[PDB]
Structures are given as structure tokens and as C-alpha cells.
Write an enzyme that holds these catalytic residues in place. Structure first.
Site, PDB file in Angstrom:
ATOM      1  N   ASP A 242       0.171 -12.748   6.425  1.00 36.53           N
ATOM      2  CA  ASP A 242      -1.235 -12.700   6.072  1.00 36.53           C
ATOM      3  C   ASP A 242      -2.072 -13.355   7.176  1.00 36.53           C
ATOM      4  O   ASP A 242      -1.726 -14.423   7.674  1.00 36.53           O
ATOM      5  CB  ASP A 242      -1.422 -13.442   4.755  1.00 36.53           C
ATOM      6  CG  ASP A 242      -2.837 -13.822   4.509  1.00 36.53           C
ATOM      7  OD1 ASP A 242      -3.622 -12.922   4.153  1.00 36.53           O
ATOM      8  OD2 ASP A 242      -3.174 -15.017   4.672  1.00 36.53           O
TER       9      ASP A 242
ATOM     10  N   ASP B 186      -8.554  -5.648  13.746  1.00 39.34           N
ATOM     11  CA  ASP B 186      -8.424  -4.219  13.531  1.00 39.34           C
ATOM     12  C   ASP B 186      -8.017  -3.971  12.082  1.00 39.34           C
ATOM     13  O   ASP B 186      -6.903  -3.567  11.782  1.00 39.34           O
ATOM     14  CB  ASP B 186      -7.431  -3.619  14.522  1.00 39.34           C
ATOM     15  CG  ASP B 186      -7.164  -2.142  14.264  1.00 39.34           C
ATOM     16  OD1 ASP B 186      -7.950  -1.513  13.521  1.00 39.34           O
ATOM     17  OD2 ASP B 186      -6.184  -1.601  14.795  1.00 39.34           O
ATOM     18  N   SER B 187      -8.965  -4.225  11.180  1.00 40.83           N
ATOM     19  CA  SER B 187      -8.695  -4.207   9.749  1.00 40.83           C
ATOM     20  C   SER B 187     -10.002  -4.103   8.978  1.00 40.83           C
ATOM     21  O   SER B 187     -11.012  -4.685   9.387  1.00 40.83           O
ATOM     22  CB  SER B 187      -7.952  -5.470   9.309  1.00 40.83           C
ATOM     23  OG  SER B 187      -8.271  -5.787   7.960  1.00 40.83           O
ATOM     24  N   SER B 188      -9.967  -3.391   7.851  1.00 42.99           N
ATOM     25  CA  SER B 188     -11.141  -3.271   6.974  1.00 42.99           C
ATOM     26  C   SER B 188     -11.439  -4.596   6.273  1.00 42.99           C
ATOM     27  O   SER B 188     -10.574  -5.148   5.576  1.00 42.99           O
ATOM     28  CB  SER B 188     -10.940  -2.171   5.919  1.00 42.99           C
ATOM     29  OG  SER B 188     -10.609  -0.923   6.500  1.00 42.99           O
TER      30      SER B 188
ATOM     31  N   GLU C 184       0.298  -8.695  11.299  1.00 42.59           N
ATOM     32  CA  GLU C 184       0.178  -7.540  10.418  1.00 42.59           C
ATOM     33  C   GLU C 184       0.983  -7.824   9.151  1.00 42.59           C
ATOM     34  O   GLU C 184       2.161  -8.182   9.233  1.00 42.59           O
ATOM     35  CB  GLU C 184       0.677  -6.275  11.138  1.00 42.59           C
ATOM     36  CG  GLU C 184       1.074  -5.126  10.202  1.00 42.59           C
ATOM     37  CD  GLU C 184      -0.106  -4.612   9.398  1.00 42.59           C
ATOM     38  OE1 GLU C 184      -1.124  -4.233  10.020  1.00 42.59           O
ATOM     39  OE2 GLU C 184      -0.027  -4.615   8.146  1.00 42.59           O
TER      40      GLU C 184
ATOM     41  N   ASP D 252      -0.371  -0.224  13.702  1.00 41.44           N
ATOM     42  CA  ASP D 252      -0.058   1.031  14.380  1.00 41.44           C
ATOM     43  C   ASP D 252       0.141   0.853  15.878  1.00 41.44           C
ATOM     44  O   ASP D 252       0.722   1.735  16.523  1.00 41.44           O
ATOM     45  CB  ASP D 252      -1.167   2.034  14.125  1.00 41.44           C
ATOM     46  CG  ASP D 252      -2.518   1.478  14.564  1.00 41.44           C
ATOM     47  OD1 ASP D 252      -2.727   1.333  15.798  1.00 41.44           O
ATOM     48  OD2 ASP D 252      -3.296   1.091  13.669  1.00 41.44           O
TER      49      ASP D 252
ATOM     50  N   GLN E   8       0.840  -1.186   0.000  1.00 39.57           N
ATOM     51  CA  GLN E   8       0.000   0.000   0.000  1.00 39.57           C
ATOM     52  C   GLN E   8       0.878   1.239   0.000  1.00 39.57           C
ATOM     53  O   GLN E   8       2.068   1.183   0.313  1.00 39.57           O
ATOM     54  CB  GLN E   8      -0.940   0.011   1.218  1.00 39.57           C
ATOM     55  CG  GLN E   8      -0.193  -0.087   2.553  1.00 39.57           C
ATOM     56  CD  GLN E   8      -1.038  -0.713   3.667  1.00 39.57           C
ATOM     57  OE1 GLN E   8      -0.524  -1.469   4.503  1.00 39.57           O
ATOM     58  NE2 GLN E   8      -2.332  -0.402   3.682  1.00 39.57           N
TER      59      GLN E   8
ATOM     60  N   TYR F 264     -13.080   9.132  11.008  1.00 37.92           N
ATOM     61  CA  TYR F 264     -13.506   8.069  10.116  1.00 37.92           C
ATOM     62  C   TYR F 264     -14.716   8.540   9.314  1.00 37.92           C
ATOM     63  O   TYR F 264     -15.454   9.408   9.783  1.00 37.92           O
ATOM     64  CB  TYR F 264     -13.857   6.811  10.908  1.00 37.92           C
ATOM     65  CG  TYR F 264     -12.613   6.054  11.352  1.00 37.92           C
ATOM     66  CD1 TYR F 264     -11.376   6.225  10.703  1.00 37.92           C
ATOM     67  CD2 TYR F 264     -12.656   5.212  12.397  1.00 37.92           C
ATOM     68  CE1 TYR F 264     -10.235   5.518  11.128  1.00 37.92           C
ATOM     69  CE2 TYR F 264     -11.540   4.513  12.823  1.00 37.92           C
ATOM     70  CZ  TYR F 264     -10.352   4.646  12.208  1.00 37.92           C
ATOM     71  OH  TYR F 264      -9.286   3.907  12.704  1.00 37.92           O
TER      72      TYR F 264
END
Ligand SMILES: NCCCN[C@H]1CC[C@H](N)CC1
Ligand SMILES: NCCCN[C@H]1CC[C@H](N)CC1
Lengths: 271, 271
Positions: A138, A156-158, A107, A87, A32, A214
Site C-alpha cells: 500500500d 500513476d493511480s486514480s 504497487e 503496468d 480488483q 481515457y
């Protein structure tokens, strides 16, 4: 000064913008685009693929609610997995619990972690705790491979196969909470997520967090329980000195976050 | 297509933007600039001096909470004043109550009312109700002049003398709710507002509404009671056919809106 603007096909027709005091870092990682800038009024900002991941001014709202909702319900959590969350904000909240013996974080993009360690020291400080173990990997491969089971998993991820792996990685009385969309824009997605979870979990609940950076100013928590009591009522108060500095979460807010607007209740009571 | 962008010194360093499907109307009135446009994803939008007043997609959140919080606490409200609120949303919610015998609205800018009657028919429909009386007038002059007292006053508009006039215009057991800032940006102002109110009212409470097109995605309600019981608990359920269509407010949400984040509680418990 210039302005950062957050556009996305995921929220078409709207955008949020912050004024840039100064750009701090920019790279393209294997996964990303990464941007870090000091805003004029929200402190430092982390951006991933042009979508705001956090800001210093309000990150405590999301990290406190995502962590202390499940961690006050789980009686004596010993082993906790964080999925995503490079983070470190969740980990920082987790380290406040003396009962916890191990924190695994998975992560896929180590640049996120490294950028957070460098530029967001009051957010990534949990990484210095000896209980914390980092897997650059992954999450599907991690979940398929881990031998331990967890008392709490915090996504904690989309994906229905993904929630099978979560269920199997949880203890018999374990809990999973996952980031899950704003009720103002993706009610269809929330319905799908509750549908996937309900096939495996016997108690699936949805809470709302107010957080201004957000999209639409809020974000949901998908709450999955293997027991029938669910996650709306804490089993403990956060009274020790480690929690004296909490800025959003409290015993009353916990339950209140599950009291949803009428139109959403209507869409999700029939699933 | 172009984009509307909401800038203001009141929230420096941030901005919200909506994509414009088509501009519908624009004028400069004696008091403010007026813009009406069809957005691509929030329906029609009303803008006053470049600040969003409402959108079709989410206005029900603010109008339902501002109205049904006080109107479910007041036992048998008969006379209600709306200050500001030319768009008619509050009045639309008020007309649902059969007990109400009179609704006065005081709005300084008749262009707002006229634009809402023309372009926002599902919001301004309350104006056709015989109980509704319109005063094109400054609210301080109205409040100083009115002979009646009110069971509920709803201040739908962005001063210590002003709250004296509200107190005097209320019945002995009357209630006032007033729009009162986002907890994410003007905690100093909220503290001042609670300070002014507490000098006159014995019970001053603060609730939060989630609404994405207001700055920071939320907006507070300053809640002022002459009785000691306050406004956090409804005294009635909205069960009749007039309320079947409610999209945000419900009995549980009412109380939950008063459960504030920890940092705000800390700032306002010492006032
Ligand atoms: N990299 C951004 C934060 C979320 N990171 C996650 C890492 C693990 C992946 N399976 C899913 C995204
Ligand atoms: N015109 C915009 C809506 C608020 N209107 C109010 C009219 C009465 C004034 N004393 C305060 C603003």
C-alpha cells in the site's frame, strides 16, 4: 464479435467501447477484477474493475507526458518513486535516463505487474533494469516507511494526508506529478486536488494530455513543485539515442499542455 | 433508459455512447437522417446519419476554436463564408465581431438549420442577425457561383478541386480553416488534406481541439493561409464585452493548439 464497454458512476451518462478480437486473460485478484483482451483496432487492452487502464495504441501519450514533464525539469534526478503503475509504462520511460540511479515502484496488486510482464512485453520491459526495485505494498505504508527521499515522485493511480507524505518523501527541490481527472467531467475534483496540494506545495499547476481511451479523451496531470519556478518549462532537451523513439512528448508540447481551456482557468484561479 | 451509440466505418472497432433522457425529434430529410435527443449528462444532442454533430455541453470548444483562430489573425475581416454549419454555432461566434459586415452560410440541408432554430436556441441565435444570409445549396455550386470574395472561409463539414474553389473565393490575404479529422485515427487523411492545400496555399498548418463527443475526443483544424505568416499567432485580443463569455478559446490556447504530438509531426513534415 463482442464489445467491451466502459461504464462507471464516475462518468455517468456516457460510455466508451472497443471491439474484442479475442479475450486473453481474466481473473479476480485480492484487490480488483483483471481483464486482458486483444481489441480489433487498439491492440491489447488492460482493464481493471471494468475501467480501461491502457491500450497498446495510445499508452505512450500518458506514459511519455507523465514521465518527461517532471524528468526534464528536475536537473539531475537520481532517485525516483512510481506510485501505482504496475503496468510498467512509466518505468519504461524512466529507464531512458542514464542519470537515474534508482527507481522504486510501489504497487499494491502484484497480479497487475505479472499480467503486464506476460501480456504487455513492450510496456513492462523496464522491470529487467537493475535500478528497478518493486514493493508490493500500500502506498501510504510505503511512504510512511521509506527512509530515502526522492527527486521525482510520479503518482500513476486514480487525500490531504497523502500529499503530506509525498511532500516529506521529496527532496527540498523535488517534484511530484499525479494523475488528476478529465477537465470535461470532474472540475470539482480538480479544484479539491489543487487545494490539497497548494497547502503544502508553493507551485501547483495542471496540464492536459490527449489520450482517446481515457474517458472524455483526455486526462490531467497535477503538478506540484517545492521551488517557485514550477513544471511548465523543461530545463533540457531529450536528444540522446534513448529518446529517438518518442511518439508524443517534445520540448514544445511540454509547455503547451499547461495552456488550459478558459472555463477551467476560471474555476481554478481563485483557489 | 436507452443509450445512443455512435458506430461508423470511419472509426472501426470503437464506439461512444450517451444515455438518453428523452428523444425530441427524428426525421429522414432529403440528405440524411436527423435525430435530436436530450441526453442525461451532455444536454441536448444533434445526430446526423448516426454521427454526433454537437452537444450542448461541449460545442463551445469546437465553435470557439474554429472561429476565433482565423478571426483573430485576419486584421479587419469584413466578409465571411461558413460552409456547412447549419447548426449555427460558428455564426454565433462570428456575430460577436462588430467589424464584420456580412456572413454568408451555405448549407445543403435546411432541416439542419430549422431543427437547430427550434431545439438549440442558444446555438442558432446568430440567424437573427441582419448580416447573416442563408443559402440552401451545395457548396461547390455556391463557390463556383459567388461573385464576392471573402476574408475568411470556415469549412464546418466532414477534394483538390474544392480547395481551388476556396482559394479563388478568398481575398489575396484571406484565410480558410476546415474541419480535418482526429490525429488518433486518420493520419493518412490528414496527410492528403495537407497535400491538397499545399499545392495552392503557401502556409498550411494543423491544430488540435479537445472535445469529448467527437471520436477519440479531439478534432483537427486544417489551416490555410495565402500569406507566409500563417495562423498560429493571433493579431488581436478578444477584450470587448461580446467575448467576456468565452469558455475555451484564449490568446494562449490559440498558439498551443498547433503544438502537435511527435508522431504526427513526423508524418507531416515530409509532405
Ligand atoms: N493496481 C492498479 C494500479 C494502481 N495501483 C496502486 C497500488 C498502490 C495503492 N496504494 C494505490 C493503487
Ligand atoms: N448538413 C450537415 C452539416 C454540413 N452541411 C454541408 C452543407 C453543404 C454541403 N456542400 C456539404 C455539407
Amino acid at each position: 464479435k463482442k464489445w467491451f464497454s466502459e461504464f462507471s458512476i464516475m462518468w455517468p451518462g456516457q460510455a466508451f467501447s472497443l471491439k474484442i478480437k479475442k479475450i486473453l486473460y481474466e481473473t479476480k485478484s485480492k484487490y480488483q477484477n483483471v481483464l486482458v483482451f486483444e481489441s480489433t483496432t487498439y491492440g491489447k487492452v488492460l482493464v481493471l474493475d471494468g475501467v480501461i487502464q491502457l491500450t497498446e495504441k495510445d499508452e505512450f501519450a500518458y506514459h511519455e507526458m507523465m514521465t518527461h514533464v517532471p524528468m526534464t525539469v528536475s536537473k539531475e534526478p537520481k532517485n525516483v518513486l512510481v506510485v501505482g503503475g504496475g503496468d510498467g509504462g512509466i518505468i519504461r520511460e524512466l529507464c531512458k535516463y542514464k542519470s537515474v540511479e534508482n527507481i522504486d515502484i510501489c504497487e499494491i496488486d502484484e497480479t497487475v505487474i505479472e499480467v503486464s510482464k506476460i501480456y504487455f512485453k513492450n510496456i513492462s520491459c523496464g522491470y529487467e533494469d537493475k535500478r528497478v526495485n518493486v514493493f508490493i505494498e500500500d502506498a501510504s505504508k510505503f511512504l510512511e516507511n521509506v527512509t530515502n527521499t526522492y527527486d521525482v515522485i510520479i503518482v500513476d493511480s486514480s487525500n490531504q494526508n497523502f500529499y503530506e507524505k509525498i511532500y516529506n518523501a521529496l527532496k527540498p527541490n523535488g517534484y511530484c506529478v499525479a494523475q488528476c481527472e478529465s477537465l470535461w467531467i470532474h472540475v470539482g475534483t480538480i479544484k479539491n486536488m489543487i487545494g490539497y496540494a497548494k497547502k503544502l506545495f508553493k507551485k501547483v499547476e495542471y496540464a492536459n494530455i490527449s489520450i482517446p481511451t481515457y474517458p472524455c479523451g483526455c486526462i490531467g496531470i497535477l503538478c506540484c513543485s517545492k521551488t517557485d519556478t514550477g513544471l511548465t518549462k523543461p530545463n533540457k532537451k531529450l536528444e540522446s539515442k534513448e529518446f529517438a523513439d518518442l511518439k508524443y512528448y517534445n520540448y514544445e508540447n511540454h509547455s503547451a499542455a499547461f495552456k488550459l481551456p478558459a472555463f477551467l482557468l476560471k474555476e481554478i484561479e481563485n483557489i
